[PDB]
Design a protein around this ligand. Structure first.
Ligand SMILES: Nc1ncn(Cc2ccc(Cl)cn2)c2ncnc1-2
Length: 167
């Protein structure tokens, strides 16, 4: 039993809710919140900009030190950093950005990072400003993630479409 509330169950292990991931993180304090990161961990907009803003820029400060030490992530890769005031940990995952021409097949690799964590609060990878089709992203999520994932979808209109077109 966990503290996630109001989710619709899609499969054995995937759940979905119309929610602001920032507000959901602050209420649940999950062990892991997933960030929709880029390889430079520059949290300027979308989910990343919102999560970072909610940490009063502490996420960005920590991320800049991470990059200075380790260099950029790979597209499809991830790193675990602090969750600050939002979660115990933040899993920064880099989905492909279609608006940069990155290979959508890397989306499966990106979701594989979730399998290293038993339970996660997450957005749909490569959705929003990353330019992928959120319905495809949901399908890859369901077909790749085996651990328990609670998907927060900010846009109500999109949430309803994801539920209604879900196979
Ligand atoms: N605070 C928030 N802002 C934006 N989105 C949309 C979004 C989804 C996926 C990606 Cl890759 C980029 N952006 C959110 N979903 C849940 N919470 C969100």
């Amino acid at each position: 039993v966990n503290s996630f509330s109001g989710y619709l169950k899609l499969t054995d292990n995937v759940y979905i809710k119309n929610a602001d991931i920032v507000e959901e993180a602050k209420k649940v304090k999950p062990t892991v919140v997933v960030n929709a990161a880029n390889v430079y961990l520059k949290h300027g907009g979308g989910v990343a900009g919102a999560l970072n803003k909610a940490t009063n820029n502490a996420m960005q400060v920590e991320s800049d030190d991470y990059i200075a030490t380790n260099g950029p992530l790979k597209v499809g890769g991830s790193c675990v950093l602090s969750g600050h005031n939002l979660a115990k940990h933040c899993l920064h995952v880099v989905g492909p950005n279609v608006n940069k021409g990155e290979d959508i097949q890397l989306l499966k690799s990106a979701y594989e990072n979730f399998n290293q964590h038993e339970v996660l609060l997450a957005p749909l990878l490569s959705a929003g400003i990353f330019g992928a089709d959120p319905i495809h992203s949901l399908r890859v999520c369901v077909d790749t993630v085996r651990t328990n994932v609670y998907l927060a979808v900010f846009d109500k209109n999109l949430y309803d479409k994801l539920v209604s077109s879900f196979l």
